[PDB]
Symmetry: T
Subunit: 91 residues, 12 copies
C-alpha cells in the first residue's frame, strides 16, 4: 500500500458550521488520517494522509460534496509531511 500526506487550505464560510467535524468524518470513511485545523483568519487547514486516490476523493469532496459550510476555495498545498496522525482530529 502507498501513503502520502497532502495539505488543503479551505476558505469561505467554513468555521462554526460543522465543517471540521464533517471533514473529519468524511476522511475517516475514506481510510484517511490527519486533522482539520481552524485558522485565525477564518480558514480551515486540512491535512490528510493516505493513498493518492483517496486524497483525490477527499479533495473532490471538499469542493463539491454536500455540506453545511459554504466553501469558496480549496487550495492544494505542497507538503513534505510523512508523520502518522492518529484519527482525524479537530484542531
Amino acid at each position: 500500500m502507498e501513503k502520502q500526506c497532502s495539505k488543503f487550505i479551505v476558505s469561505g464560510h467554513v468555521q462554526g458550521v460543522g465543517f471540521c467535524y464533517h471533514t473529519s468524518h468524511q476522511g475517516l470513511k475514506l481510510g484517511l488520517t490527519g486533522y482539520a485545523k481552524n485558522l485565525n483568519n477564518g480558514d480551515v487547514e486540512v491535512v490528510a494522509c493516505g493513498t493518492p486516490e483517496r486524497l483525490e476523493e477527499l479533495y473532490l469532496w471538499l469542493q463539491e460534496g454536500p455540506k453545511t459550510a459554504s466553501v469558496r476555495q480549496v487550495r492544494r498545498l505542497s507538503s513534505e509531511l510523512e508523520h502518522d496522525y492518529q484519527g482525524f482530529e479537530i484542531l
Copy 2:
C-alpha cells in the same frame, strides 16, 4: 454569530434504534451543540444550540430526514437555555 437554543420533543419508535446517535451526528455536521436525552415515557428530548437557520435545518431533518427511527411527531418547545453545551452528547 448569533446563537440560540431550541428544544424538540420527538415521539414514536425512537429509542434503541440509533436515533440519538444519528441526531447527534447530524447536529454536529450542522455545527450545532446540545444533547439527545432518552425520556422515561419513550420520547427523546433534543436540545440544540446554534444559528436559527441551522436549527430549522435540524428540525426539518428530525421530521423528514432518512433515519432508522419511526418518527410520528416532532414538537418544538420554548427554551431560555443559553448554556454552552460541549459537543452533542447522548443522555
Copy 3:
C-alpha cells in the same frame, strides 16, 4: 432474549449509606444496565434494563436483600424507555 426497562422508587434512609453503589453492583451481577439516581426528597430512583426475570430479582433484593440502608418501601413505576445504557452508574 426479550429486554425491557423498569423504574423503581426506593424510600426510607437510602442516601449516603452505600445504597446506590450496592444496587449498581447487584444489577451488574444480574446482567442489568441502568442507573441509581438520588432524588431531592430522599428517595432513590433505580432504572434497570434486562430480562423480566432479572428485574424481578432486583426488586426482591431492593426490598429484603442484605444491605446497609433501611428500606421502608419499594415501588415499581411505569416505564416505556427502550434505551440501552452502558453499565450501572450513580446519579
Copy 4:
C-alpha cells in the same frame, strides 16, 4: 462534622455568563460538593452539600457575591439529599 444538602433556584441572566463555573469554584473553595444545573426556563439549579455554616456562606455569595451574572432572585428550597457528590459539577 455534620453535613447537609441545600437546593437553590437562581433566576435572572445567569446562563452563558460563567455563573455555573464560578458557583462550582466558589463552592469548592468553601469545601462544598454538589452541582450547578442549567434549567430550560433560564434558571440555574444549585445543589450544595456541606456544613450549615458553609452553605449559608454560599447562599450569601449567590445573592451578593461579585459575579458576571445578574441575579434576580435566589430561592432556597428544602432538600433531603444526603448523597455525597464528587466535586462540584456543571450540568
Copy 5:
C-alpha cells in the same frame, strides 16, 4: 425488544480503506452494537447485536451499501453471542 448477534466475514479490499469505521458508524445509526475486526488474511470480521430487522439492514449495507471498500463476499456465520457490547469498536 428482541436481541440477537450475528457474525459477518467480509472479503476483498476492505482494510485501510475506512470500512471498519464506516461499518461501525452504519451500525450505530441502526442502533446496533458490536465490533469490526481486522483479520490477518485481509478480511474484516463484523459482529453486530440488535433486532433481526436491523441486523438484516446492516447485512444488506455490507453487500451493496455505498462505501470506499471493494467487497467481494459477505459470509454470514452463526453466533450464540448474548453479550452486551459497548458501542461499535474497531479491532
Copy 6:
C-alpha cells in the same frame, strides 16, 4: 508468591447474565488477575493468574458459587501464559 495462569471454559446460559462481571469481581477478591472473554459459541473463556490455591478456589466458585448464570460445565484447559494482566477485564 508463585503465580501461574489457568484457562477455563464455561458453558451454559452464561452470556448476558452478569457472569463476566461477577467472575472478575470474585477473582479480584481472591487477589487474582486476568480476564473473561465472550466466545462466539456462547461459552465464556476465563483466564486467571495467581497462586494455585486461589485458582482452585475460583474453579469451585465457577461451578457452585451463587450466581445468576446457569453453568453447565467448567473445563480447565491448558495454559502457558506468564504475562501479568492488570485487574480483571471483560472481553
Copy 7:
C-alpha cells in the same frame, strides 16, 4: 449526617490476596470513603470516613468478615483527618 474518619492497621497475610479490593468494595457498600494502602512491612493501612455506626461495622468486617486474607490483628488508631476522599482507592 455526622462524618468521622478512622484509621486501621491490619497485620497478617493481607497483601496480594485481594484484601485491598475487598475492603474497598465493602467500604463502598457501607457508604464509606477513604483508602487501603499497602505498607512495606506487609501491613495494610485502612482509612475510612463516614458515620461512626458504619465505621464500627467496617471495623467488625476487618476482624471477622469472610475474606481471602488471613487477618492477624486489627489496631484502630486515632485520626483527626476530616478530608473528603473520592471513592475508596487502593494505594
Copy 8:
C-alpha cells in the same frame, strides 16, 4: 446571544508565572471560551470568544487585574475566528 472571537498578545514577564492558568480561570468566570498560548518570544497569545462586553472585561483584566505576571503591554490583534472552543485551555 451575539458571539465573536478576539485575539490578544500579552508581553512582559508573562510565562511561567501562572498567567495562562489565571487568564483561563478569569475567562471562564466571564463565560468565555478559547485558549492561552505560550509563544517562543516570551509573549502569550490569548484567544477568547463571547460577547464583546465580556471581551472588553477580559482585556481590562489582562492590563490591570491583580495577577502574578508583570504585564508590559496588551494588544488586541485581528481575528476572523468563528470556531467554538471547549473551555479555556493552555498551550
Copy 9:
C-alpha cells in the same frame, strides 16, 4: 528561571473546608507546582515548587489570605526536593 521546592505544615481547622482546593488554586495562579496533602493529625502538608519570591508569596497567603479555613499556624519545613510535579494535586 531558578526553581526550588518548599514544604509547609498548616495546622488548625484546615481539612474538609476547601483549604486544599483553594491552596491548589492559589499556587497555580502563582505559577507553582506541587501538592496539598491531608495529614492524619488534622494538619495539611503543602509542597510547592517555583521561584523563591512566589514561594514567599504562597506562605503569606497560607497565613492571612482570605480563606474558609481557620489557620492558627503555618510552619515552613526543610526540603531538598528537585522533582518536577505536574499541576497542584490534592492528596
Copy 10:
C-alpha cells in the same frame, strides 16, 4: 512512502520478561506501528506496519537484539494486514 504489515510469532522465554514492552519501545523508535500480543501457548505475536526496511530492522532485533527475554525462534508469517494500528500496544 510505501507501507506494509508483517506478523512475527516469537517463541521462547518471552512472556512476563519485558519483551512486549521492549518490542513496543523498539518498534516506536523505528517509526513502526502495531502490537505485541501474549498468546496462551506462551508465545508472543508481533504485528508491525511500516516500510519494508524498518520491518527487517525489527525482525533482526527480535532475533539477536539485546533483551531480557530468551528468544528461541522468530517465525515470519504471511500477512494481508493493511489496517492502521495506533502506536504499539501490548495485548
Copy 11:
C-alpha cells in the same frame, strides 16, 4: 514463576534529572513492576517486584547502568510488599 519485592534507596543527584523515568523504563524492560518515588530529602525510593534474577539485574543497573543522574549510593532495604503494582509509576 515466583515473585518478590525489593526496596532501593537511591541517594545523590538523582531528582529532576530523568532518573525516575529511566528507572521506570529500565524496570519495564526487565519485566518488573513497582514505582520510583521522589523523597523530600532528595533521595529516590525505588520499589520493584519480580524474580530475584531481574531484581538483581535492576539493582546492578541502579549502580553502574549508564544514566544522567549522579548516583552516589544504592541502599537495598528489606520489604514485605506482596502487592501487585500496575506498571512502573513515578511518584
Copy 12:
C-alpha cells in the same frame, strides 16, 4: 535548579521514522520537557526545557546519537520560552 528553553530545527529524513518518539524518550531520560513537532516542509521542530547542561546533551544527541532518522542539519534557535511543559509530546 536553573531551567531555560531552546528550540531546534532538525532537517533530513526525519518524519515517520521514529525520530519524534526517540527524541522525546531521550529528553525524558535527561529530565527535560517540551515537544517534538512535525513541520509541513519535512522538518521536525524540537523544543526542550531544563538545565543548560542537559540541553547541550540533547543537542549533541540530535546530531550524533544513534537513531533511525537521517539527520542533515540541527539548527539551534533562540527562545524566550519559560512555560512549564508537561512531559515530552509529539505534535
